[PDB]
Homo-oligomer: 466 residues x 4
């Protein structure tokens, strides 16, 4: 309790994401890359038995961090401290551990595996947020409410129609995160110190084919589909820009959605879930973490821009901060957003009251236009006469509860007789919303359902705020 701890790791993100970048995960993946490196070169006919491999396999999860810190505070080599620590627990394999590979073989490829597994943790949570909002969207598909532009009252829409506006942004984020996992991220493989594979060629007597095969077989055992061909020392750091840009994009989406909910809470039309007077505390927390996620990407674009030639180590420290925290911040935002979506309470009576109080004034443009075409040669008089009816109608609605007030007023004033027969539809809120209901139906069937169909066997998790 005496040392500071980032609340992203201790409070806000899920346990699975926190462990995905843990030091134990890094070493177990380091030892898994050595097992794959061995069973790939042993596959290409080399002085590696099957006896050394299973001993590696049997001693993968266990790790002696004591000797690792002893070698790390002596020669100051994190990789070689673990190629020696692993050699102590694998006496038969020791000469054939990390055979021919450079340090970035275990460092870069393990980071790539962690980034991929990180996306596989986030993807179901994006789809869950989509699923929860989509259910609410068709629940309130016809719940008529006031639209707001400039934070001022505008023509009617429906609450479900507004939620689809939020879902659209999440669909773009799901698309981006799926392309990162399935296309953008490639394997680093075995490339040497400067990407020329000069050191692996010596181990294979200058046989280009076994060296190419070495990089091909390592890509399958790692679960990747291809690998970069012309790297320097590391995988092209531009990949880290693509990752954080997509994560920062999620932050922008979450910040807009939760700001909208905070705005709608001030109108008393919605209320976020709480524990069983109340403030939108969860949407506010989601905005703060989303803002932090939004701006974390500028560190990577500056880092990539100053990578010197074949490599420069000024990316090492910042990558172990920004990459895990971006994933931790994205994980915490989507956890909160799924909460808010699952428990968001809407108030139909408040929406109708706020709607009824503004409809007398929203309609004065459209009726005045129709009156002018019917012969209203005194446009200012006709407008002033309409504004008087609307102002008096808004008073009768509030104090007397007469909802159909403006209808009766204009029907009793035969100044507006040319449009008496058109008023029952002109004044119908179900007419003013346009195609709002049908737009929800097409959007859910044509775009939402295909996007999250592959996540059907993992949409059931209820996310809880603790």
């Amino acid at each position: 309790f005496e040392e500071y701890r980032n609340p992203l790791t201790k409070r806000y993100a899920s346990r699975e994401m926190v462990c995905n970048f843990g030091e134990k995960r890094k070493v177990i993946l380091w030892r898994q890359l050595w097992i794959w490196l061995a069973e790939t070169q042993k596959e290409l006919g080399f002085d590696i038995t099957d006896e050394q491999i299973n001993e590696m396999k049997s001693q993968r999860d266990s790790v002696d961090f004591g000797t690792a810190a002893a070698e790390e505070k002596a020669r100051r080599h994190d990789v070689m401290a673990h190629v020696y620590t692993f050699a102590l627990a694998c006496p038969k394999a020791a000469p054939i551990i990390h055979l021919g590979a450079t340090s970035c073989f275990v460092g870069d490829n393990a980071d790539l595996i962690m980034l991929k597994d990180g996306l596989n943790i986030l993807l179901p949570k994006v789809a869950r947020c989509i699923d929860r909002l989509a259910k609410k969207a068709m629940l309130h598909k016809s719940l008529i409410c006031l639209a707001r532009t400039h934070l001022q009252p505008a023509q009617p829409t429906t609450m479900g129609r507004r939620i689809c506006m939020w879902i659209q942004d999440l669909l773009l984020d799901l698309e981006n995160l799926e392309r990162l996992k399935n296309h953008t991220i490639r394997f680093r493989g075995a490339k040497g110190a400067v990407g020329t594979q000069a050191s692996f060629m010596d181990l294979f007597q200058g046989d280009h084919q076994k060296v190419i095969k070495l990089d091909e077989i390592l890509t399958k055992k790692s679960g990747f589909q291809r690998s970069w061909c012309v790297t320097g020392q590391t995988y092209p750091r531009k990949v880290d820009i693509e990752i954080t840009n997509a994560l920062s994009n999620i932050g922008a989406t979450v910040h807009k959605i939760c700001t909208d909910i905070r705005l709608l809470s001030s109108f008393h039309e919605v209320e976020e879930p709480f524990e069983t007077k109340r403030n939108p505390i969860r949407s506010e927390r989601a905005c703060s973490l989303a803002r932090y996620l939004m701006h974390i990407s500028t560190s990577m674009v500056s880092t990539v821009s100053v990578q010197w030639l074949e490599r420069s180590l000024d990316d090492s420290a910042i990558r172990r901060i920004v990459l895990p925290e971006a994933f931790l911040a994205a994980d915490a935002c989507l956890t909160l957003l799924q909460n808010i979506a699952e428990g968001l309470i809407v108030y139909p009576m408040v929406m109708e009251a706020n709607l009824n109080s503004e409809l007398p004034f929203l309609v004065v443009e459209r009726i005045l236009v129709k009156m002018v075409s019917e012969g209203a040669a005194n446009r200012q008089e006709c407008h002033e006469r309409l504004r008087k009816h609307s102002h008096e109608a808004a008073a009768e609605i509030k104090l007397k509860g007469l909802k159909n007030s403006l209808m009766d007023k204009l029907l009793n004033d035969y100044y507006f007789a040319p449009i008496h027969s058109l008023l029952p539809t002109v004044l119908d809120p179900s007419y003013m919303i346009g195609r709002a209901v049908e737009q929800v139906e097409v959007f859910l069937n044509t775009e939402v359902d295909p996007a999250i169909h592959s996540y059907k066997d993992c949409l059931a998790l209820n996310s809880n705020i603790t």
Copy 2:
């Protein structure tokens, strides 16, 4: 000369991109959108004559800003100012211009056309930058040189193998811009004030299928393949993040490439073209690429605080950021191509550097060889035995990855970039 001018618009960027976001082109797109709207409504049955549509086509390219600036002064609303300016230039089509539409029908759709056309200007320049470095990489695929990690001498490589390392970045940049132009950017269409098409439903007496056809026909007349369907007032501003994110990625790529050239120039191994000396062009390229690198950070903030169906605090900043981002990327690609075309190498200076730094690199190979033979010969100091697969890596990469990526740009690779 009295009023300050942005150097991006004044000199750095080419005039194609400069005019792509100009005001004249903007109202030409506004007028062309009103023509497509009239054609569509006439196609859907509305009483609009061919004489009115031919009248709009004829006076499309003639803009009288003196009238537009005048009516804008009283209106404070520039879209209607250009509506009634076109109505004056088209007395017959006057009652049907902008019929049933809202301001964002021309505001947002013209932006999407300018943004899509701006990408069409950038894309061949990315392809030329790729092709120019591709020629240098093959030309110097065997030019042995010193590789540097931590900016200190590392095991040898070839200059062409390093150039392909730059090209790999530009290849990822190319497909991002193509995905933007061919997939990410959708049309806004005719959605109304809050995206519910309530005004066009009224204009069509509630015919849902007419309003649907209106949006599909307009999307096709404008050259797009689809439109958003659950917008608020505007197209989702996340598209603006997507656009500026990819453009900022161009800057990061250009900055590293031109920084690598500045680094190698201090070793007298490479030299940028000119008419020792100053790498002025590579330095300007880094300067402009840095401004482009960070320009997207205001778009992510803008999107995050878009209130409900719309707030207008996106309008002024999009007028600045979006054109400047394209102008910055355009100027960087013009400089990068010119530098790539005239990239001078010095094999003798490269050779001497690898010679004076080789002692700090052979100590490992002689260690195991002395363990092999001698306990406790001239060609083991030969760097040609130490470059690995750098030669073959250039070949397969150029043949299997670079050539397919820019195959579609074969008809426009010849244009050389001249920096004066």
Copy 3:
């Protein structure tokens, strides 16, 4: 109309700021630095007459840009193109033009003069914004209104008390901009190519004293108080961080103030000025330009970080973009903010109505606490009985207009008799606001008036939106 133009230069910023960074201003300042350079070395007894100087003085404003572009598209030297153009118009002075100075002598020092003059354009506009808000703050010093936390109703404050919250931020910005003009920005002077003054020493036969005097006299004629001593080629670019950071800070202030006004417009308690139904278009425009100003600073901090040793030219292009646009964006924001402040309309009846509708529920915590100390041993019963009175009181206020409803209800219910004598004060809104009125008075007299006292002869300008 065919070429793009930044709306900051053509629409949003003032003419005086646009011209402050114009190319004509740069050259006239270049020629002024040559006149000061000549009359400083002629002052130190050199082969420079008084005849060459006044010819320079007489031919300062005029500039032949034709020959300048002819020499610039031939040898590609912007400085030397103007040392030759000026030499053509000054035939007597030509050998003693730019005598001994490097290119950055005219480039850096002119930029410094432009940045200082830019701050002198902004400072009166910050003080004007302070003055306009301060007048409104004491106008509405006692105008009781609802405070808002989490965008939810909170205890009462006053509109003037809220405006002082805005003024406080502007006072910090005024302080920062005054320290930039009067302390942070130093003169670059004459330093040579790498700041060692090696080239000026040759012109003075190795006399350190005349070289030191040269830099001292040039600082006075330029209007600066001191100069940097150990520069490289240019003045330390960290100064550009300080400038843009303070300008970006103004953006944050303007964005918060105008977002608050947009929020208060949704409650119909305020309305920004318009032309003689309406949206807060000016506050929205001010937020967009403030957001652009907020983020423009990250380019400079990246630029300074990669300045290579004595100099690297990768700052030249970005400085002529970011520095003028930051000043232009700051100028446009303060122009808008002064407009909004001068014409901001408040609605006291709406504030009181929104206040009266929420006071029944704001007070239930404080009365319940007093009841418990008086013997209310059923806290939940007492709370539920209060919430029923408050809910019924809010209905009587809205429909019947009975403002003193909750008072009469609790006075007629002798369940709450122990606090009957304390209710007239407990329920007094003038009591609930605490020291809001007195805090406005002390803040205006003790902090606002001294801060803008030096701008008294320039607070009268009315800023107009065009």
Copy 4:
């Protein structure tokens, strides 16, 4: 080892800054604020016994988080969770803990104390970094070397004259942090829920002068000189911009200095200390300085959208950004001092570089000399005649500017920075 940990908190930053923002210290400050509040209210006449105040002092440093974590689970409000945790640890003082105060009385004031103390940790490290480079600059004030503009050889200078160029940046950084600690940061005090002190006015039966004295006494008991007077619920978050802006300025300064060292190391002129080789420490310093460089961009965004008297979307991000900014600056200053203490120079390597690059620098002086004598000698090639006032500039700068700036830190300059 299973749960990920931030390397800033795990290794890079020293434990003084790490514990300065820890949770235990936070509630110790919360409890100390409640003690000062009780002392002040007793001083102003409220019925609070010395026995109750002595009870709070005695149990201040003993925190039982098991009780705090328990009551926080039901309350969801961590301030009251620690209120009634201290009430359990102080049965006598229980009815008067947090009396009349709101949550931000302890939340914001403890932050300001942690922020002010964090600056007090950073300031001597800035002074040591200044003093260490000051010693190298005087030691090498006459060490002639090659100056580089555009990273190409320029007219000669001395290594100490270049080191002072770095020091000039650190001097501006020093007075910024001092202005932050001594001027910019004010106390929040006892302002209430919306800053109007309405609750304390009620507690004091409306005595304006008592409430005024309450805020003045608390400001003095806490070690501050003044408090804000027209806040909303919190102190103005612009202070958080001011703080992170100055810390980001440290990163930009460290990044350029350590980049200059990396550049000079590729020329084998300088070398960072160790136990050719890798400038690992200068590279980590650049890496951490880059993260620190950009961390303020979320504070400027946070301030811009603070809604009216308060919105809570500042709380979570301030818990991350503010401590990490201090931790980043602390780690950078620890690395910069260690590099400055062991900065190795190589005068022979420096001399040879100026020799092999001198032809591209003397062409101008011989031009005017041949115009002088000869129409159309050995010591004109002597670089000691070409360094200008670089020697005297180091002297006056060190004597007249560096020594006064760090005079107040003379009692704490000896602590050496060891990087292992």
